[PDB]
Amino acid sequence: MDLPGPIHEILMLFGEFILLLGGLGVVLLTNPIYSAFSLGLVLVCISLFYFLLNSYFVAVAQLLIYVGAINVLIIFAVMFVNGSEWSKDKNYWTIGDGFTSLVCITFVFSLMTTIPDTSWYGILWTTRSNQIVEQGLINNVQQIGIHLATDFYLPFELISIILLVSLIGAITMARQ
Amino acid sequence: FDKGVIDGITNGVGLASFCIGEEIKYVGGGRISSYLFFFLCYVSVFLF
Amino acid sequence: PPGTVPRWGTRSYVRERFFEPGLTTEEAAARIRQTAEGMRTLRPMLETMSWKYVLFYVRLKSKYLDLDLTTAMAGVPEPRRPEYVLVANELVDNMTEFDRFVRTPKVYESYLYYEKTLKSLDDVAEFLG
Amino acid sequence: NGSFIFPECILIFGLILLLMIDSTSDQKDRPWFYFISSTSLVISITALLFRWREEPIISFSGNFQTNNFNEIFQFLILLCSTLCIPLSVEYIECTEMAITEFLLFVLTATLGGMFLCGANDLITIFVAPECFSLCSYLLSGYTKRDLRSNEATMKYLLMGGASSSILVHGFSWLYGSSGGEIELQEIVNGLINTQMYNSPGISIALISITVGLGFKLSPAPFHQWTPDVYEGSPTPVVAFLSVTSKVAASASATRILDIPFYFSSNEWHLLLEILAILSMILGNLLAITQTSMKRMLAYSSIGQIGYVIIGIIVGDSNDGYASMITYMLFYISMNLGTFACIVLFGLRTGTDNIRDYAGLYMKDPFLALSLALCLLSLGGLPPLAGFFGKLYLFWCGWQAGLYFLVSIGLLTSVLSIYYYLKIIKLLMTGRNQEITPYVRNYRRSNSIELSMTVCVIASTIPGISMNPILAIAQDTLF
Amino acid sequence: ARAALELHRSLCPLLVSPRELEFLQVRDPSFCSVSMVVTQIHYTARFPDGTVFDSSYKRGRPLTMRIGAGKILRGLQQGIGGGGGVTPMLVGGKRKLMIPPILAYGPEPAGCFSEAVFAQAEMNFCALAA
Amino acid sequence: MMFEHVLFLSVYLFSIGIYGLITSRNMVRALICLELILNSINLNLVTFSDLFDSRQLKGDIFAIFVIALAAAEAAIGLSILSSIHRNRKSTRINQSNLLN
Amino acid sequence: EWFPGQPRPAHLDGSSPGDFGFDPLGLATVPENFERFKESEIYHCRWAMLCVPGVLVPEALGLGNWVKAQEWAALPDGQATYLGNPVPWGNLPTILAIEFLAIAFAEQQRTMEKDPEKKKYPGGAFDPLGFSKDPAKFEELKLKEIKNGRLAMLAFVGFCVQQSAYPGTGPLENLATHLADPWHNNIGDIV
Amino acid sequence: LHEYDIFWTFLIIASLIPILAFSISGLLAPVSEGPEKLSSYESGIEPMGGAWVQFRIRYYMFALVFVVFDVETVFLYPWAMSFDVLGVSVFIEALIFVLILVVGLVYAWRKGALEW
Ligand SMILES: CCCCCCCCCCCCCCCC(=O)OC[C@H](COP(=O)(O)OC[C@@H](O)CO)OC(=O)CCCCCCCCCCCCCCC
Ligand SMILES: CC1=C[C@H](O)CC(C)(C)[C@H]1/C=C/C(C)=C/C=C/C(C)=C/C=C/C=C(C)/C=C/C=C(C)/C=C/C1=C(C)C[C@H](O)CC1(C)C
C-alpha cells in the first residue's frame, strides 16, 4: 500500500495548519466548552494524521477511544465548573504568562534545532532489513493482531487489572 | 575579640542556616502552577 | 584505501534544499551519478514485496534527481546538448511512472520498469562527467 | 506457561479473592481479610524464597527479567508491603471508610512495584510505573471528606502526569534514534548498526529520561511534590509510598541507566551527582524549620536520605551495589519503625505537630524509647545501624575516587542530627505545667505493637550483624 | 562527526579466505556453537587500510547482540553465526573479517551533520566472542 | 516531507501542551492540556514505527497502550474532580495553597 | 524620564509619543524646529527598522553581508545577484536610474504635503487594516514604533562602527567572534 | 488495504457537502428577521435567566463506567482477528482479559453505580 502522489504534502500542510489553530484554541479561549470542542477538533485532525501514514488500527482506535468516550466524558465534566469570562488583553493573567511564553519557547528552540540535524532519510537506509520482512503474506490488522499476543503477553495480561482498579477507584471516589 | 568575633562566627555558622532555611522555604509555597513552572525551568536549563 | 568524502548529506531535508542554499555545476554531477549506483540496490527489496521502501527511496532520489537534472544539464557540453536534454524526459518519466506502479502495488509493471528505470539513468550521467 | 510470574500470580489470586469476598460475603470480613491478605503476601514471599541463587534467565519472550539482583528487590518490596499492611489496617478502620478496596489498592500497587523491578521491555517498564502510579492518586486521596487530601491529589496527579509524560517522550526519542528497538539489553546494538549514537538526540533522550526518573524518587530540584502530599494523605499511605516507591524507583533506575547507557557514563555520572549534591542539602535545611511530624519526615527521611543511596550509583564498578542493597535494607526498617510509632501515637492522641510530643516519656516510656531508637538510627550514630549503612556507603565511594560527595554527605548528616536531637529533647521532660492537655489524657494500653517492636530491633541488630548481609549482597551482576 | 583516536594490536592472522561472498579468516576456535539467541562479543572495527573508528574496549562491557535474527550487518551475521560455506565461531573463538561493501551499509553513509561512516565504505573487524 | 514535517509539529504541540498546563486555572483545562501532551507524545511515537520496524510493529502497540492509560488517567482525574467539587463548591486550582 | 533627577526642560511636557525629557542641546527650542525634528526622527526610525534585518538575514543565509551586496557596482561590468540569481538589470546605471526616479518621486510626494500631522502619521492607504481604530492603542502604537525605531538606529550604528573597527565583517560574524571568548573578544580590544 | 484514495475523495466531498449546502442556502435566502431573535422557542413566556441545571451526579457514573469498559473492545479486535491464525493460547489469554472486566462489571452492579 502507498499514497497517491504529490497530493501528499498538500494534505500534510493543510492538516498542520488546522492543528496549529486547534491547539491555539485549546490553550487561549477562556470558555472551557469551546476549549473542549477545539480539543476534539485537534484529536480528529490528528487521527487523520495517523491515517495518512499507512498505520490503520492506531488511527481508527484513537478516533474511537478518544474522539468518543474521553471527549463526551470531559463535556460531562465541564458541567461542574461554574464561573467563566476571566480577564483578557494580552496575557490576561500575571507575568507568569510571559515567563511561560519564554521558557516554553526556549524548550522549542532547543528541540526544534536538535531535530534538523539528524538525517532521518539517512537513518532510514541503515535499517533496510527491519521493514523488509512483512512475514511473507500479512495485512495490517493481523500484524498487530498476532504481534500483540505472540510476544507482548505480559503487558496485555497486565492492563486489564489496571482498568479494573481504575473503575473501582473512580466509582468509590465520585460517589459521595 | 572572643565573644564578639569567634563566638560570633561559631554562631553565625549555625545561625545563617536558621535564616536560609526559612528564606528559601517561603518561595513558591503552593499554587501548583508555580510548582510546574519551577519544575519546567530546571528541565529547560538542564538541556545545556 | 583511506576514507571518503561525505559530500553534503548531513541535513534533515529541511536544512538541505530549503535553508543551506548552494548547488554548483559538476557538484550535481555527483548526485546524478550517485542515484545510479544508488537506485540499483532496491532489486532485492523488489524481489520480496517491501512496498514501503520502494516508495520512500523513490520519492527522495527523485526529488533529488528532479533538481540536479535541471542544474547539471546546464554545464554539460553546451555546443551539442539537445540529447542530454532529450534523455531527462525519459529518465524522469520512467520514474514518474515507477512512482505510479508502486502506489497501487503491482509487480509485473513495477519490476518491468525497475530495469528500464536504471537502464536509462546510466545514460543521463553518461553525457555528464 | 511459566513460573516466573507465579510470585505475582499468587498475588493476583489473593487480589481476586479480596475482590470476591466483598461481592459474596455480608459482614464477616473486617478481621478476616486483615489476615487473608497477609496469607497471600507471606505465600508470595515463600515462593520468592525458592528462586534464591538462580540464573539470569530471560523472561516471557524476553519481557521483564529474572536474575539475582532483581530478585533481591522483588523480595524487598514484598517485605515492605508485609510490614506496612498491619499499619494501614487499623488506621482506616478508625475512619469509617470502606476497607476492602483500600487493601485492594495497596495490593495492586505492590504488584505494579514488583513487576517494575524487572521490566527489560521498554513498554512493561512504562505500564508498570503507571500500574504503580495509577494506584497512587487513589490512596493518596482516599479520605474524601477531608480537605487536605484533595490538595494532595491535585498537586500529585498533575505532577505525576507531567513527569510520566516527559519520561515516555524520552522513551520515544530513544525508540526513534535506536533504529527501532525496545528490549533493554538490545539497544547498544541497534544504536550502532544505526550510526546515530554519538550524535545529538541521545543526549536529549538521556535528560528526558533522568528527569522522569528523578521525579519518581524526588531529589532536590524536583522534590516540590513530596512535602505536600506526605502531609495531605493519611500517614499509613505516606509510609507505604516513602518505602516502596523509593525501593521500586531505585531498582528501575540502576537497570535503565546501566544496561542501555554504557557510553554516556561521563555525561550522566555527573548529572546524577548534581542531583545528589542538591538532594542532601535542600532536603535538610527546610527539615530544620519544620513543626509538623509528617512533613519533617518527608524532608529528612526522603528529601535527604535519597542521597547516599544514589551516592554509589555514580561511583559503581559493581563493587558498590552490595552497599546500596544493604543501605536499602537498613532504611526500610529504620523508616517503618518511626512511621509505626507515629501512627500509633497520632491515633492514640489526635495530633501531628511536634509541640505535643512533650512528656510522652513519662506517660508511656516504651513508645518513646522505641521512637527515640529509630530516630537516632536515622541520625546515624555508631552502635546503631544507620551509622554502618552510611559508613559502608562512604568507604565504597571514597574507594572510587570521587571526593566532593562524601564530605558533603558527612556534613549534611551532622546537620541532620539537629532536628532528631530536637524531638528527642522534647520527649524527655517533666515540666508538668508545659505539657499540653494531649499527652495528659493518654490511656496507654497485637498488630501495631508487634510491627513496631519487630521493626525497631532490626534498626539496632543488623548494624552490628551486617556480616552475613554483606556476604549475601555481593552476588549482584545487573 | 567522524573518526577519533584509539590504540591496540591485531595479532597478525593468516591469509583470508573469501569464500565467494565476504572475506573470512579464523584465529582460534575453542568451545561451542551458538543458536539464534542473544550473544555477547567484543569487536574492534577498522577502515580498509589503517584507521580505527570504534572498539568495544573503548567502553565498558563488550556489547551484546542477537546472532540469528536480522539485527546486525549481514556480513557479521554471516561471519559469526556461520554463513553458507563457513563454520560458525565457537563460544570462546576468535576470527577476523574484511567486509565487502555489499554486505555492509552499502553506497550511502549515516549522517549526523557529518557522516560517521565514509560513504560507500568497506570495513574490517576483529571479532572475539565471550 | 512526510518523515520530516510531522516531527516538526510534535514539539510545536508538546510545548503548547506544557504551557496550557502551567497557565491553567481550572482543573478541567489542566486535564485537557495533560491529554494534549500525551497525544503529542503518541504522534511523535507512531511515525517512527512506520518508516522502520514494519516486520514486527513495536510502536503501534505502544501507542495503543499509551491511549489506554490516557483514558484511565482521564477517568480517575475527573473522578477526583467530583469529590473536590463536593467538598468545596468551586474548583479554582490556584486558590488552594493550604498545604505548604 | 531618561535621567531620573533632572528637571524637565520646560518644552517637553509629555504631549508627544516617545518624549522623555531629553534635549540637552536645546535643539527643540523653536516649535517649528520642534515639529520638523519629529518628522526626521520618525523617518530615520522608519527606514532603519527596514534596513537592519535586510543587513542581517542575508548574512544568515549563504548571501554576502551588507558590504559585499554593494560590491559588483564597483567593477564596471557589475551585475547583481538577488538570492544568488543574476538579475538582468543588476548593472549599476540601470538600478541607479530606477532608484533615482522612484525614490525622488515618492519622497517628493512627501515634500508636497503639509498637514503637518500626516507628515508623521499618514495612515489610510498606509493602514490597510486600520490599527488606528482605538486611539488609546494607536497612541501606544506610536510609542512601540518610536522606541523600536530608536533601537534600530543604535543597532545600525553598531553595525557600521563594527565595520570600521573590523573591515569586511558581519554583525553575526562579529557576534560569533565574541561568542567564542566573550572575555577576550570585546570592545575592549579596539582601544 | 490497497488504495484509500476513494476514501480521501469521499472525505473531502462529504466534508464539502455541509458547507456547500449552508452556502447554497445563504445565497438564495432572505436578508430579513431583524425581530427580537434573542429568545429560543417553546417558551411563550419570554423568559430569561437561570443556571446550575446539571444533574451530572447520576449520568457521570454512567459516563465513567462506559469510558472504562470501552477499552475492552479495541483490545479484543486484534484478538478477534487472530484466533485461527494463532493457536488456542490467545483464547485463554483473552478469556482472562474479559473475565477481569466481567468481575468489574459485577462489582459495579452490586454496589449501586448503575441507577435511575
Ligand atoms: C565606549 C566605552 C564603553 C561605554 C559604552 C556605553 C556605557 C553606558 C551604556 C549604558 C547606557 C544605558 C542607557 C539606558 C537608556 C535606555 O535604554 O532606557 C531604557 C528603555 C526602556 O525604558 P522603558 O520605556 O521600558 O521605561 C519604563 C521602565 O523601563 C521604567 O523606566 O530602553 C529604550 O530606551 C529603548 C529605546 C531606544 C533608546 C535606547 C537608549 C540606549 C542609550 C545608550 C547609548 C550609549 C551610547 C554610548 C556610545 C559610546
Ligand atoms: C504600518 C502598518 C500599517 C498597517 O495597518 C498594518 C501593518 C502593515 C502591519 C503595519 C506595518 C508595520 C511594519 C512594516 C512594521 C515593521 C517593523 C520593523 C521592521 C521593526 C524592526 C525592528 C527591529 C529591531 C528592533 C532590531 C533590533 C536589532 C538588534 C537589537 C540587534 C542586535 C545585535 C545583535 C543581536 C548581535 C550583533 O552582533 C550586533 C547587533 C546587530 C547590534
Coordinates of C-alpha atoms in Angstrom, one line a residue, chain E:
Chain E
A1 CA 31.2 13.6 13.4
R2 CA 34.0 11.4 12.1
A3 CA 36.9 9.2 13.2
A4 CA 38.6 9.5 16.6
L5 CA 41.6 8.0 18.3
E6 CA 42.3 4.6 19.8
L7 CA 45.2 2.1 20.3
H8 CA 45.6 -1.6 20.1
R9 CA 47.3 -4.5 18.4
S10 CA 45.9 -7.1 15.9
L11 CA 47.7 -10.5 16.5
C12 CA 48.6 -10.8 12.8
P13 CA 46.5 -13.5 11.1
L14 CA 47.0 -15.9 8.2
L15 CA 45.7 -15.1 4.7
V16 CA 42.0 -14.5 4.4
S17 CA 39.7 -17.0 2.6
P18 CA 37.0 -15.0 0.8
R19 CA 34.5 -17.9 0.3
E20 CA 32.7 -16.2 -2.6
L21 CA 30.8 -13.6 -0.6
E22 CA 33.0 -11.9 2.0
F23 CA 36.5 -12.1 3.5
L24 CA 36.8 -14.9 6.1
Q25 CA 39.7 -15.6 8.4
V26 CA 40.0 -17.7 11.6
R27 CA 42.3 -17.2 14.6
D28 CA 41.1 -19.5 17.4
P29 CA 38.1 -21.8 17.7
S30 CA 37.6 -23.0 21.3
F31 CA 34.4 -24.4 22.8
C32 CA 30.9 -24.5 21.3
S33 CA 28.4 -23.0 18.8
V34 CA 25.6 -20.6 19.4
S35 CA 21.9 -20.8 18.3
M36 CA 19.6 -18.0 17.3
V37 CA 19.9 -16.4 20.8
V38 CA 21.5 -13.4 22.5
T39 CA 25.3 -13.4 22.3
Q40 CA 28.0 -11.1 23.8
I41 CA 31.0 -10.3 21.6
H42 CA 34.0 -7.9 21.6
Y43 CA 34.8 -6.1 18.3
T44 CA 37.4 -3.6 17.1
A45 CA 36.4 -2.2 13.7
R46 CA 38.9 -0.7 11.2
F47 CA 38.8 1.2 7.9
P48 CA 40.0 -0.6 4.8
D49 CA 43.6 0.5 5.2
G50 CA 44.5 1.6 8.8
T51 CA 42.1 3.7 10.6
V52 CA 40.0 2.5 13.7
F53 CA 36.7 4.2 14.3
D54 CA 35.3 2.1 17.2
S55 CA 36.3 -0.6 19.6
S56 CA 34.1 -2.4 22.2
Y57 CA 37.1 -2.0 24.5
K58 CA 36.6 1.8 24.3
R59 CA 33.6 1.3 26.6
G60 CA 32.7 -1.0 29.5
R61 CA 31.1 -4.4 29.0
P62 CA 31.5 -5.5 25.4
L63 CA 28.2 -5.1 23.6
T64 CA 25.5 -7.8 23.4
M65 CA 23.6 -8.5 20.2
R66 CA 21.3 -11.1 18.5
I67 CA 23.0 -13.8 16.3
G68 CA 20.3 -15.5 14.2
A69 CA 17.7 -12.8 13.6
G70 CA 18.5 -9.9 11.3
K71 CA 19.5 -7.1 13.7
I72 CA 23.1 -6.5 12.6
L73 CA 25.3 -6.2 9.5
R74 CA 24.6 -9.1 7.1
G75 CA 28.4 -9.6 6.9
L76 CA 28.7 -10.2 10.6
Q77 CA 25.6 -12.4 10.9
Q78 CA 27.2 -14.4 8.1
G79 CA 30.6 -14.5 9.7
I80 CA 29.7 -15.1 13.3
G81 CA 26.7 -17.4 13.3
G82 CA 28.1 -19.1 10.3
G83 CA 27.2 -18.4 6.7
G84 CA 26.9 -20.5 3.6
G85 CA 30.2 -22.3 3.3
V86 CA 31.6 -21.0 6.6
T87 CA 31.7 -22.7 10.0
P88 CA 30.3 -20.8 13.0
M89 CA 32.5 -19.3 15.7
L90 CA 32.8 -21.1 19.0
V91 CA 31.9 -19.7 22.4
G92 CA 35.5 -18.5 23.1
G93 CA 36.5 -18.4 19.5
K94 CA 38.2 -15.5 17.7
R95 CA 38.1 -14.5 14.0
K96 CA 39.0 -11.7 11.6
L97 CA 36.9 -10.3 8.8
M98 CA 37.1 -7.9 5.9
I99 CA 33.5 -6.8 5.0
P100 CA 32.8 -6.1 1.3
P101 CA 30.6 -3.0 0.7
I102 CA 27.5 -5.0 -0.5
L103 CA 27.2 -7.0 2.8
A104 CA 27.6 -3.6 4.6
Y105 CA 25.8 -0.3 4.8
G106 CA 26.1 0.0 1.1
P107 CA 26.7 3.0 -1.1
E108 CA 25.3 5.7 1.2
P109 CA 26.5 6.9 4.6
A110 CA 24.9 7.5 8.0
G111 CA 24.8 11.3 8.6
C112 CA 24.6 13.3 11.8
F113 CA 25.5 16.7 10.3
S114 CA 28.7 14.8 9.5
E115 CA 28.6 11.2 8.2
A116 CA 30.0 8.9 10.9
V117 CA 31.0 6.4 8.1
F118 CA 32.7 7.2 4.8
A119 CA 30.1 6.9 2.0
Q120 CA 30.3 3.5 0.3
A121 CA 33.0 2.1 2.6
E122 CA 34.1 -1.5 3.3
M123 CA 35.5 -2.1 6.8
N124 CA 37.4 -4.7 8.8
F125 CA 36.6 -6.5 12.0
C126 CA 38.5 -8.5 14.7
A127 CA 35.6 -10.3 16.4
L128 CA 36.1 -12.3 19.6
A129 CA 33.2 -13.9 21.2
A130 CA 32.8 -14.1 25.0

